[PDB]
Amino acid sequence: MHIKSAIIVVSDRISTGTRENKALPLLQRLMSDYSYELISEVVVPEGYDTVVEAIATALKQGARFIITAGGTGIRAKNQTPEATASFIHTRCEGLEQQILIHGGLSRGIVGVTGRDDHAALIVNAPSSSGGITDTWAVISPVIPNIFEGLDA
Ligand code: NA
């Protein structure tokens, strides 16, 4: 089971190059042993339009697992959750809750874009490495179950 995957790092400073993209190599380590096939990775500035464009592009390219890092706080430009919600068919609020139980200002969501074997799972992680590892700890074990359900 190859899961076509995309990473979207959301950060003004990484986008311009004045800050290191630590999320990408960390996510690649967490993904490396089903299997994840990384078809796309990008860095975008903060905002609604930039995140929407990145998600819609990854979905068009066939990604079925999209993980974002960053843009989940309360600043005006922190619009990752809002951008993400525009694509969601069904939220996985239990998983959001577990991420919080396992790990307050992150508004990151988790959800799927449909209910069938074309649907994608989108997960918003925080910018921090610790926040990414806590998100991953909750999502990783349930990935097989999500795709088995969508693909039934
Ligand atoms: Na964040």
Is 146:112 a contact under the CB 8 Å cutoff? yes
Is 36:65 a contact under the CB 8 Å cutoff? yes
SS3 of residue 9 by DSSP: strand
CA 127 / ligand 1 centre spacing (Å): 4
- State how far the alpha carbon of 101 is from the alpha carbons of 46, 69, 97, 145, in Å: 27, 19, 6, 20
Classify domain 2-152 by CATH number: 3.40.980.10
CA dihedral 136→122→70→98, nearest 10 degrees, is -40
CA 141 / ligand 1 centre spacing (Å): 22
SS3 of residue 88 by DSSP: coil
Cα angle value 103/105/107 (rounded, 5°):
90
- State how far the alpha carbon of 95 is from the alpha carbons of 86, 121, 143, 151, in Å: 19, 12, 11, 19
CA 21 / ligand 1 centre spacing (Å): 14
CA 70 / ligand 1 centre spacing (Å): 4
SS3 of residue 81 by DSSP: helix
Q: Which amino acid is at 82?
A: E
Q: Is the dihedral of CA 139, 130, 52, 81 positive or negative?
A: positive
Q: Enter the resolution in angstroms.
A: 1.5
* Both tokens assigned to 128: 């921090």
Is 4:37 a contact under the CB 8 Å cutoff? yes
Q: Which sequence spans correspond to the domains of the chain?
A: 2-152
* Both tokens assigned to 72: 């989940």
CA 30 / ligand 1 centre spacing (Å): 18
Query: CA 14 to CA 62: how far, in whole Å?
Result: 25
CA 98 / ligand 1 centre spacing (Å): 17
* Both tokens assigned to 114: 């449909």
Query: CA 117 to CA 59: how far, in whole Å?
Result: 13
Query: CA 63 to CA 111: how far, in whole Å?
Result: 14
Query: CA 78 to CA 72: how far, in whole Å?
Result: 5
DSSP string, 90-142: EE-HHHHHHHHHH-------EEES-SSTT--EEEEE-SSHHHHHHHHHHHGGG
CA 85 / ligand 1 centre spacing (Å): 16
Q: List CB contacts of 131: < 8 A, sequence separation 6 or more.
A: 103, 106, 125
Structural biology method used: X-ray
CA 101 / ligand 1 centre spacing (Å): 17
